[PDB]
Each structure stands twice: as C-alpha cells, then as structure tokens.
Symmetry: D3
Subunit: 152 residues, 6 copies
C-alpha cells in the first residue's frame, strides 16, 4: 500500500526551502500532501502553492482549517509526517512537536530531512522582516509567489 | 539546620513533570516550598497543587505576589532554588537566570535536576496547544488537575 | 520509483535503539539493508543481527568492507541512507556526514529519524564502558545479542 | 577594505557588556559607528551613548530610523558590521542574520566578538525584568546610564 | 534520603572549579565525599585534595579503584551524585551518564550545579595542554596543588 | 592597535574554507600571518600554502614549532588572532580557547568569522577519511594543494 505523508505548515510565504523539501519528499513518498494550516485568501494561497508544485505529479495541496495535525493526517490516510530541520533551535523545537505527536497518534511516524545549505538560514519570520524593509529576497521565493507578492 | 528550597513556577498548569521534580527534590531538601507566582482562583490553584502534592509531608504551597524570586526566597528562609532542565534551550534560559540570581542574592544557590525522559518534551505552551485543539494529554497531568480541568 | 535504504553502522554491539530504528524504517521503505561495516567473527555479527531482525520481511543484512558509504550504497541499489539523531551532538555530526555524502553522491538522499526516548542516552561507547565494569544493560540489547555476549 | 564598522543595536538600555564590545572593536577598526535604531527620546539616548563612549575618539553615534542594517551601513560607508555572541542561542540567531546580510550586501563583512564572561548572561529582556522589580543591576550599567535611569 | 553525596572525578589536576563546586555543595549535603578514582601517587593525591579541602568540616576524601560510580556510591552509602555542568557539551554528556546511572541505580539521584562563570572555560584537558607549554594557570589551581606541581 | 593578526592552524591539508577566511580577514587586517604549526616537509607545506595565498599581498606564511598560540603571536607582533566558527561545537571549543588565551595574554584580542556555507561541513578529520577512501573532494581543496596530494 501507499506511503503518504502530510507536510504541515503555514507557508506564509512559501519558500524555495519549502519547495526543496517538497521536491525531495516527493521522491521518498508515494504521495505528499501539503497541508496549509489557515491578507491572502484560502482560495489564493492554495492557488500559488498548487502552481509552485505542478511539476510533481504525486503532490497535492489542502486547506486544513486549523486542528491537530495528527487528526488531519489520520483522515487523509497519512502514516507519515515530514519535516525539515535547519539548525539546533529548529531540531529541538521539532523534536518536542514530534514527541507530542507520537503520544497522540503513535502509529504516525515523523520523518526528517535536513535543509539544503542555501536555505538553512531562511525562516518566514526573517524573510517577512526583510520583505517589510524591501530587501530583495527573490532568490528565495518560487517566482510565482514572488510575482504574486509584489502587489503589497 | 533545615535546608529549604523554593521551587518557583506558574504551574499553568502543573504537570506530572513538575510532580516528578517535586517528588525528587523532597528527598533532597528538608523541605520544599512550591512558589506559585501570580484561568482559576489564586485560591483554587493553591488548592489543586496542595491536593496533588498531598502525599509529601515536607512540601508546602505558598502563593506569591509577583516579586523577585530571590526576595521571595530570602523571606522564607529558602537558601536554595530548585529548577529542572529538560533540553538545551532550557539549560541556556535557566543558566542565565541563575547567574542573574547569583548576582542578586549571592547567598542563594540554584540547584538543577534533569527532566525525567517521559516529560522532557512537555512545556506548558505546547500542552496548551494540545488542550486548545482537544487532544488527550491526560497522562501528563496529575489526576486531580485533569478532572479539575475538563470543567471549562 | 522503488525505495531502498542502507542503514550503515558498526553495531558494536547492536542495541534495542538500533532495532527500533530498523523497525520504524522497515515501514517507510520497500526495503532496508543493514550495512555492518567491519570480540566476535563477522559470521556471528551477521548471524546475530539477522537473528535479532528475523521478524521484518523487507530487512536484510550485509557485511561491508569498509569503504565510502555512498559507494557501498550504489552497489546495493540503495537510493536512501537512513540515520537516527539522539541529541544535539548527534545532529551536528550526522549533518556533516550527510552533506559530504551529498557532495559525493547528490542522488542518494539521507533520511532521519529521532531516537525513541528510552534509548536516546544509549551510544555504544557508553554501553561498552558500562559492560566492561559489570553493569546490567540487558534491557538495552536484543536478547540473543545479550545471550550471546554472556557466552563470550 | 577601509576599516569602518557599524555596530547596530537598540541599547535599551546600553550595558557594560555593550560598552566592552565597543572598546574592543575600537582597537580593531579605524572608526566605529554606533547605530542606534528607534522610554527616552532618541534624543536622550544619543547624548547618553556618546557620554559613555566619550573616551574613544574613533567612536561615534548615529540615530537610525529602522531600515535594513546593510542599507544603513552603505549610507555610512561602513564595510563592517560588528556583532557580539554570548551563548549558543545568540550564535544561531546572529548567524541567520549574517547569512541574510551577506545575501543583501555580500561586500559587507560581519565580524564577531565573544561576550566578556561577566556580561554573558546579560540580555535586555532580562535586565528589564529585573529593573521592573527594583533589583540592583547597577554593576551592569555604565554609571551615567544608571543616574539617568532612576526617574520614571 | 540521607544527605550523603558522592563527587566523583579524576582530579588531575583539581582546579579551583572543582573546589568551588565542593564548597557549594558542602552548603547542601551533610556529607560530601570526594571519590577520587585512580603522575603523583594515590597518597600524594589524597594528601593534596585533603589539604585543598581542609576548611570544610563535612567534606572528606576517599580514593577508589575505577569502577561504576553508582557501585562506589552504594558502598560509601551516598544517595546523591553531584556533578557540574560548564557548557552545552558538558550538559549533553552529563545527561547521558545521569540517565544510564538512573537505570543502574534508580535510587541514586544525580544533582547538578552550574560552573561558576570564571571557571566555565577550564577543562582538565585544556588545562593540561596549557601546563604542558608552560603557561601561567596558577589562578585556576589551589595554591597548594600549584606548588606541589612546580616541584614535580 | 596595529592590525596584525595571526591565523593559527595545522593546515593538514589546507582547504578552500581556510582560504576563504584568509581572504576575508585579508580585507580587515593590515597583515595576516598564517601560522603553520608542525607527509610533507614544513618547507613543502610552506610553499604549498604560499602558492595558495600568492594573490593577497598582506598575507604571509610562517612555520612555527608547536607552542602556545599566544606566545607565537607575541613573537611576531600580532595583536589579533583570527578564528572561524562552523557550528555549535566549534563555537564552544573556540570559546574556551579564546577565554583561556585571554587569561594568558589579555592584550591579544581573538576575532571571529563564520564559515562560508559551502565549507561549513568541512573539517579536516572529515576530509582525511574521505581522501583515505578515494572520494573526489577536489572542489574543497585549492588546486595546487590537490595536485600535490597525488603522492601516495
Ligand atoms: C504548523 C505546525 C506543523 C508547525 O510546527 C504546528 O504548529 C502544528 O501542528 N499546528 C497545528 C496544531 C497541532 O497539531 N499542534 C500539535 C502539537 S504536538
Ligand atoms: C521567569 C520565571 C517565570 C521562570 O524562570 C521566574 O523566574 C519568574 O518570573 N520569577 C519572578 C520574577 C523574577 O524573579 N525575575 C528575575 C529572574 S533573574
Ligand atoms: C556511517 C558512518 C559515517 C558513521 O556515521 C561510518 O560508519 C561510515 O560512513 N563509515 C564508512 C566511511 C565513510 O563513508 N566516510 C565518509 C562519510 S562522509
Ligand atoms: C538591532 C538588530 C541588529 C538586533 O539583531 C537587528 O534586529 C536589526 O538588524 N535590525 C534592523 C533591521 C534589519 O536589517 N533586519 C534584517 C536583518 S537580515
Ligand atoms: C571518569 C569520571 C570520574 C570523570 O573524570 C566519571 O565521568 C566516570 O563516570 N568515570 C567512570 C565510572 C562509570 O561509572 N562510568 C560509567 C557511567 S554510566
Ligand atoms: C591550531 C589550534 C589553534 C586549533 O585549535 C590549536 O591546535 C592550538 O591552540 N594550538 C596551539 C596550542 C595552544 O595554544 N593551546 C592552548 C590554547 S588555550
């Protein structure tokens, strides 16, 4: 049977780091479900995310009204969560989340990949602040998300 | 003379991990004062914690108006602060605090215990995320505190 | 495609922590190969591990002349390497090895699992040091590897 | 490159640990510009900092309205950013900012000085919490900043 | 439990950091045993540490052939292991040990103290390197260990 | 103080990480000394490194017999030591080294630069093992050093 993974996240905004991880998990799982956990509408956001990922046949996007990620995985038939780790802070944060999740849904595995070195310093919080100051972060964004962004 | 330790905290809520550290430090010190720094009434928390720590004869609960923890310890004749460490982010946060405490009250020693591995991942803000979303976190709460909790 | 994973190690000795990781990874992958990179003769090492891992159909064991882990993975048709992370130290060490592996073989992906918490303090140098002083670590080794080690 | 450094920060308030980093980095660069990004009016903040740094003739203060730090460094002609690291959390944090700044302005180098161990536990939020409760942290502040502190 | 604490170590040499830890835990325990696990002879070693520790009435020195710490605890009748933590590397190291000891002897508690800031950088191995090149590390050693040391 | 830095190391072999640091520090100091502490004759190693660095007019190579890094600096008139940081581990190790050197020679300032992200996973123990086993690590070596490694 299939191995399906939920990639949860808020994707505000989606990054090349995000896509990179999406790309690589697409190679490892039969399928990958990107759960966007809800300025930019939930008709909008899914759009851009679907556009950015169209190249991979076994990926799809989903607006999850906010709720236990393991609930939402259980519903879609996901036995795997997939997450990236970029630095120690990130490791300890995800490790906590993964331990809670194993408590709530022990039959779900969290699986990790390391961020690719070009994207390891990138976090939405740092990104937004730079956007807000109008630095050029175009190299870190899927271009559709980029084109989309500059009506701000 | 008695060696008295103050265990500061807001116990919002108190976890089995807290209890474990209290149980462990009641073996270490002559007595342990649970300083609840201020959901429910200042009366009610006291009650609950007292209930949960009832089995430990040398442990008592004192609601504290917000002040310097070291001033609060000075007041009670506690020459020791007892803290847990659960992970590296925890270590660095507590270490800062102890050093500033050592600067403020050089006579008071902060002592540390490490979290028991079943609880190392449990923080109060994560516990609260799970509760918000309806997750079963009962194995992490003192039975009285869980019962007293369903009621809101 | 098809998803084949190399789990490299020295397994000196093989713990329940190793096993946990094998079992978890036996559910992610079409198949998982255990690379014993070379006390006891390789026959026994191979035998013990096979014996201890005899419940999982899609797991096999392979002795490896030590050599680059990425080459030995090419030979097996493994596109994946599977690793545990048990703490920060483990994290920084596997990260380095994973990037180098990626530079040596950008088509093998390294995949991570966090250690399950009864085993996250276990490492074979700690084990071996405890074993050398007569300490009881029977709970930490698979029964057969244990039974076998008492015989030597 | 000409040796011109921007030392950015909020200095709310300026500590001795700040003053220490300025003194050392004024031995390294031709000129050091203290970048104060906006309690007390920026007007008072300026006076106060130039009061504390008065003995170092190659140091000077500027009030910057928040804008990208690199952009402030360009308008000033500085090719060096100077930062302090006090612990691991701070390392990973400054590292992200430096990688991002290298992106926005790769001609600008970020340079690091390790916190002098008497001020390593000292951060702003901490100091202020202590001040909020009347703790004596006078040792951590340059006398001129203490004297100006008392009025509320 | 009786407030009897084992402070195990190789003490070669014993530094002012060790002594600082001993002094601080002599404020806490009724008995602090320095379990000295065996350059100079046992005798000389015993004599020097006894001499360094002479001002604390509840401290005694005991030589011990290398063995599991928790067996040496059992035999001496200590209920506590005391250890210091100087940085993150020390934190993860001590943590694994403490976890394994709890498994060996769950009735023995490990208690932790943070290193005092001025000795946080001193490890016995960095210190041997520096002595081995003739640097002046006399401030880091108890006056008497230092004399005894020139001589030999 | 005069902008004379020492860059101490064993350079076995020398990497592009090394070269990057040198290039960057060459922009910041008036003179950078490569301090080579002693497969190759020192004389060979000297010409190799000189050849790698030939393009920076303020850089120079000096062989030193093993000794306290700060004595070597003082001998050569360097007021600054320049080091790199690649990860948390390196950060904690450098930091102990810097504090000790500061105790030993408080007039000498240690200055840090963060490793560039292509080279941040590269350590000399890691390359050696890879060279041992025959892997193409040529994008991590300056060519002249690499060509020379075809020896035996
Ligand atoms: C958005 C995400 C994935 C980032 O860490 C995480 O915050 C998440 O799961 N949000 C939805 C709520 C949930 O399930 N919490 C359970 C915590 S054990
Ligand atoms: C911050 C907290 C909740 C847990 O670490 C606890 O330390 C706390 O609020 N204490 C009361 C305020 C105080 O004494 N702050 C100065 C500490 S140096
Ligand atoms: C699996 C490992 C790395 C221990 O973590 C170790 O078992 C290993 O690889 N041995 C073969 C040598 C190798 O391939 N080195 C290059 C790694 S970049
Ligand atoms: C004040 C300071 C230095 C503390 O970290 C930092 O917050 C800072 O840079 N503020 C200016 C805004 C900026 O340039 N942000 C993007 C950095 S990638
Ligand atoms: C070597 C020493 C004294 C610190 O310099 C201490 O760390 C130590 O534990 N020594 C060996 C005894 C032992 O029981 N090891 C297994 C621990 S689970
Ligand atoms: C080459 C180098 C710098 C890499 O860490 C390291 O090997 C080094 O320090 N060598 C010289 C010996 C020294 O000075 N030791 C004590 C410093 S407190």
């Amino acid at each position: 049977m299939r191995k399906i993974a939920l990639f949860p996240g808020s994707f505000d905004p989606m990054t090349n780091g995000h896509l990179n991880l999406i790309e690589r998990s697409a190679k490892l799982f039969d399928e990958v479900i990107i759960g966007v956990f809800i300025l930019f509408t939930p008709e909008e956001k899914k759009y851009l995310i679907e556009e950015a990922t169209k190249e991979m046949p076994n990926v799809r996007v989903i607006m999850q009204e906010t709720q236990l990620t393991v609930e939402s995985a259980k519903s879609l038939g996901a036995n795997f969560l997939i997450r990236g780790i970029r630095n120690v802070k990130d490791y300890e944060y995800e490790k906590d989340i993964a331990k809670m999740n194993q408590h709530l849904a022990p039959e779900i595995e969290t699986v990790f990949l390391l961020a690719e070195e070009p994207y390891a310093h990138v976090s939405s919080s740092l990104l937004k602040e730079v956007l807000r100051f109008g630095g050029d972060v175009s190299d870190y964004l899927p271009p559709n998300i980029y084109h989309a962004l500059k009506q701000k």
